[PDB]
Amino acid sequence: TFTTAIVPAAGLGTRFLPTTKSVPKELLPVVDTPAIELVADEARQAGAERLVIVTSPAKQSIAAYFRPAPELERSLEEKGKTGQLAKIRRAPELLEVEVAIQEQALGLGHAVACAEPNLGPEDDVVAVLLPDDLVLPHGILERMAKVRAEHGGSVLCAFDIPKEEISAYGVFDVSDTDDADVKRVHGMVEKPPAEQAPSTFAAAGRYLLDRAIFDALRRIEPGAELQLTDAVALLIQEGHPVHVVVHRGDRHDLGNPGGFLRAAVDFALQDPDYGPELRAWLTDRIARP
């Protein structure tokens, strides 16, 4: 049912300095393809027709990536680079792309709130994809849509992480449903020590939010910032159904250079253009300092 997916992209990417002084984090390549394209594609495959990218005035450049490049397409076609030509055609052809300008990076809730002018009356629910999380294979938003179909309200996403490894995450307080991968959300605890974690279900950056989230974001106490978790807790307090889908597949974390490199190596090893030679090189390389 959702048609509009929101991608919050207004943070600098401090962890990727000095590169992110000049390059938007969301345009950095995983092998050859930027994360913004990877999340755009995932959104489209889940039925999004429209993408609202929230960013700063300085990173408006992310928009151009979704514009055609006619001269480049011609030059590739003339060199017989049909595979490269298909690669560059992919992102502009995925969906309709708009930008919402968040003047100052006041956090995720504020970013989602800044997308509301880009919504129309048909947007009763919106998908939100954080571009630092890659959730593999495609399809978590379709699982979350089934939960919305059944229960109404809003739907979150979790990874299943042992309590001794979960303390970097927000962690859901949950109850069971009839589906082992679907829980009712009662609340969330930020970065609990292992022995205080309410579950093994760590908050992942995929959301299906009912339009009620925007009214909730206007009614929560602003910070020093609008905390999306506070708006979700307000909905829960007011009886809005909130459930979570537990992702069982793989995932990558592009929020720091180390997790980014893991993603790129994992993908390159599966690509015949690179994999065999990379694997042979790695085998030798890891045996020395």
Ligand X SMILES: O=c1ccn([C@@H]2O[C@H](COP(=O)(O)OP(=O)(O)O[C@H]3O[C@H](CO)[C@@H](O)[C@H](O)[C@H]3O)[C@@H](O)[C@H]2O)c(=O)[nH]1
| Distance of alpha carbon 223 from alpha carbon 105, whole angstroms | 13
Tell me, residue by residue from 121 to 150, as one string, x for binding to a copy of itself by CB under 8 A and - for no binding.
------------------------------
With binding defined as CB under 6 A, does residue 203 bind ligand X?
yes
| Distance of alpha carbon 128 from alpha carbon 122, whole angstroms | 16
| Distance of alpha carbon 135 from alpha carbon 46, whole angstroms | 13
How many Cβ atoms sit within 10 Å of the Cβ of residue 261? 12
Q: Where do runs of H (alpha helix) occur along 100-139?
A: 108-114
With binding defined as CB under 8 A, does residue 189 bind a copy of itself?
no
Q: What one-character DSSP code corresponds to residue 21?
A: G
Residue 229 contact among a copy of itself, Mg ion, ligand X, none, beta carbon within 5 to 8 Å by kind: ligand X
State which of residues 8, 10, 15, 221 lies at the interface with a copy of itself (CB under 8 A): 15
Tell me, residue by residue from 228 to 267, as one string, x for binding to Mg ion by CB under 5 A and - for no binding.
---------------------------x------------
With binding defined as CB under 6 A, does residue 189 bind ligand X?
no
Structure tokens that stand for 192 in this block? 């609990």
The answer to whether 240 and 154 are in contact (CB under 8 A) is: yes
| Distance of alpha carbon 232 from alpha carbon 185, whole angstroms | 10
Amino acid letter, 225: E
State which of residues 4, 8, 97, 243 lies at the interface with ligand X (CB under 6 A): 8
Cβ within 8 Å of residue 11, ≥6 positions away: 25, 105
With binding defined as CB under 6 A, does residue 132 bind ligand X?
yes
Q: With CA atoms as reference, report the closest residue to 41 among 155, 126, 138.
A: 138
Structure tokens that stand for 95 in this block? 């969906």
Q: Is 15 annotated as a binding residue?
A: yes
| Distance of alpha carbon 157 from alpha carbon 168, whole angstroms | 16
The answer to whether 108 and 9 are in contact (CB under 8 A) is: no
Tell me, residue by residue from 78 to 117, as one string, x for binding to a copy of itself by CB under 8 A and - for no binding.
---x--x--xx-xx--------------------------
**What separation in angstroms does the CA of 208 have from each of 4, 52, 255?**
10, 14, 21
Minimum distance from residue 132 beta carbon to ligand X (Å): 5
Q: Measured from the CB atom, is 18 or 137 closer to a copy of itself?
A: 18
Tell me, residue by residue from 123 to 152, as one string, x for binding to Mg ion by CB under 5 A and - for no binding.
---------x--------------------
With binding defined as CB under 6 A, does residue 205 bind ligand X?
yes
Integer-rounded Cα Rg, in Å, for the chain is 20
Query: Which residues contribute to the annotated binding site for UDP-alpha-D-glucose?
Result: 8, 10-11, 102, 107, 203
Residue numbers belonging to the annotated binding site for UDP: 10, 13-15, 25, 107
Residues that bind ligand X (CB under 6 A): 8-11, 54, 102, 105-108, 110-111, 130-133, 169-170, 203-205, 228-229, 255
- Name the residues that contact a copy of itself, by CB under 8 A: 12, 14-19, 21-23, 27-29, 31-34, 37, 61-62, 64-65, 69, 72, 76, 81, 84, 87-88, 90-91, 256-258, 261-262, 264-266, 268-270, 273-274, 277-279, 281-283, 285-286, 289
